[PDB]
Design a binder for this molecule. Structure first.
Ligand code: NA
Ligand code: NA
Ligand code: NI
Length: 476
């Protein structure tokens, strides 16, 4: 008698560049992740011009899942996962991106990884682009500044769909495609889109042009994937941070509406196949005049997604004072602390009820199945000398989010496909390039400086989630 559906997908989520290591093994090319240095809370990662001899790049070795995946999958099986969300490293398949033929050694690696999952009861869920495009596409072509990179991505997606059509049912095109709505900081444009900005450039206009090309690439991929296997479920991937009005002040309400339009118009294109009128009017008013053709609009219309994959970690709040009639939204400056919720040590506000809010926000608009493909609590873990990791703070975060997700299914009629907590084996964080910001049920002995045995150990949350899955979410 579970609230959640009987065939509910219980898994864990990672990304290739964040855990594989082997960054130059098996023919793999240099990715955008491979030129990003380690950072920390309050210390941005640095993006370097190629791999420089005297820098620490934590994604180069990560946790060495490239060599240890067989042992790790036995831990996944003990945990009881029925699915595993990861990315296919673009640079393992097309090392520089523009080769005529794919890299067969990279195609064999994912053959072996996916086969190892499926023989242990675990279904792979694959994200095609996850912050790891070939660095050669950036330096030579400009990343998604360039229409040519659309075809390079679609070529890559098509190889992947064809090779794994019998092994992978659930796909997603561009991870957290809307992160780049924050274009004032370098991280999201470079990792979403391969944009390295030159001095004096209009950063906003370049982001919107890359977002258009990516949406076109995704839509082309959807149609091609559907032609290869109509049983594929191909979703978008939205970073869903709800943006609350600070108060019932009417300008706070409109500021929140406008911020949500700026952050989530990507979803409308993915789902409906055309641009929403508010973002179109914004672009016209700002004279952001994108290279949009009629074939683009036809591609978008014919490549709508089957479901909405999204991450949830936190919520934001905004005030509308002095935001005038335009309610322009700069994510890097305009956020305010929400006095009603706690916050993590990295400053991510803790708001389990916002997950239910997020699910209703999607469902009110789109009536599509949802897939929670990332959710997690990044926190410092401590080893007791006895050896255990008592991460009750992580059980508390996760259990309250799963309870709110159950309330959304039970009370709001949401169609929820599955739940894959993020970083369920400790890996290198995206925003900061840290091992210290731990998400996992499985501890990995490696620190921010690169020291450690890389041994895996079970935290206390491991047995907690095992029983979550065992009871299909009834025992939290
Ligand atoms: Na208040
Ligand atoms: Na901070
Ligand atoms: Ni080796």
């Amino acid at each position: 008698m579970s609230i959640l559906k009987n065939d509910f997908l219980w898994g864990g989520a990672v990304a290739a560049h964040q855990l594989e290591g082997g960054w130059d093994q098996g023919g793999k090319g240099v990715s955008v992740a491979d030129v990003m240095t380690a950072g920390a809370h309050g210390v941005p990662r640095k993006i370097t011009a190629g791999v420089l001899p005297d820098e620490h790049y934590p994604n180069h070795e990560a946790i060495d899942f490239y060599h240890r995946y067989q042992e790790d999958i036995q831990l996944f099986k003990e945990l009881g996962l029925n699915c595993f969300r990861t990315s296919i490293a673009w640079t393992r398949i097309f090392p520089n991106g523009d080769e005529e033929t794919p890299n067969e050694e990279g195609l064999r690696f994912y053959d072996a990884l996916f086969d190892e999952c499926l023989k242990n009861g675990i279904e792979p869920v694959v994200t095609l682009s996850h912050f790891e495009m070939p660095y050669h596409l950036v330096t030579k072509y400009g990343g998604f500044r360039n229409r040519q990179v659309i075809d390079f991505f679609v070529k890559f997606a098509e190889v992947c769909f064809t090779r794994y059509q019998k092994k992978v049912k659930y796909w997603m095109t561009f991870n957290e495609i809307n992160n780049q709505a924050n274009y004032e900081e370098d991280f999201a444009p470079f990792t979403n889109s391969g944009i390295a900005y030159q001095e004096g450039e209009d950063r906003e206009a370049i982001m919107y042009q890359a977002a258009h090309y990516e949406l076109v690439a995704s839509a082309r991929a959807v149609k091609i994937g559907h032609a290869i296997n109509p049983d594929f479920q191909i979703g978008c991937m939205i970073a869903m941070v709800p943006i609350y009005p600070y108060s019932c002040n009417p300008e706070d309400m409109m500021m929140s509406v406008s911020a949500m339009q700026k952050r989530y118009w990507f979803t409308d294109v993915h789902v409906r196949g055309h641009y929403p009128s508010a973002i179109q009017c914004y672009l016209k008013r700002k004279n952001i005049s994108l290279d949009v053709t009629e074939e683009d609009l036809t591609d978008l219309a014919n490549g709508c997604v089957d479901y909405i994959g999204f991450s949830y970690c936190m919520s934001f709040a905004v005030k509308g004072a002095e935001k005038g009639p335009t309610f322009d939204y700069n994510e890097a400056k305009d956020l305010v602390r929400n006095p009603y919720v706690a916050t993590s040590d990295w400053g991510w506000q803790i708001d389990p009820m916002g997950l239910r809010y997020a699910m209703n926000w999607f469902n009110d608009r789109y009536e599509l199945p949802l897939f929670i493909v990332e959710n997690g609590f990044g926190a410092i873990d401590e080893l007791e000398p006895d050896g255990t990791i008592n991460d009750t703070y992580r059980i508390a975060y996760l259990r309250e989010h799963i309870e709110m997700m159950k309330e959304a299914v039970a009370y709001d009629g949401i169609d929820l496909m599955g739940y894959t907590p993020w970083g369920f084996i400790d890996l290198v964080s995206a925003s900061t390039g840290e091992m210290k910001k731990r998400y996992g049920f499985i501890y990995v002995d490696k620190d921010n400086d690169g020291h450690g045995t890389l041994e895996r150990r079970k935290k206390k949350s491991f047995a907690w989630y095992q029983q979550v899955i065992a009871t299909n979410g009834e025992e939290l």
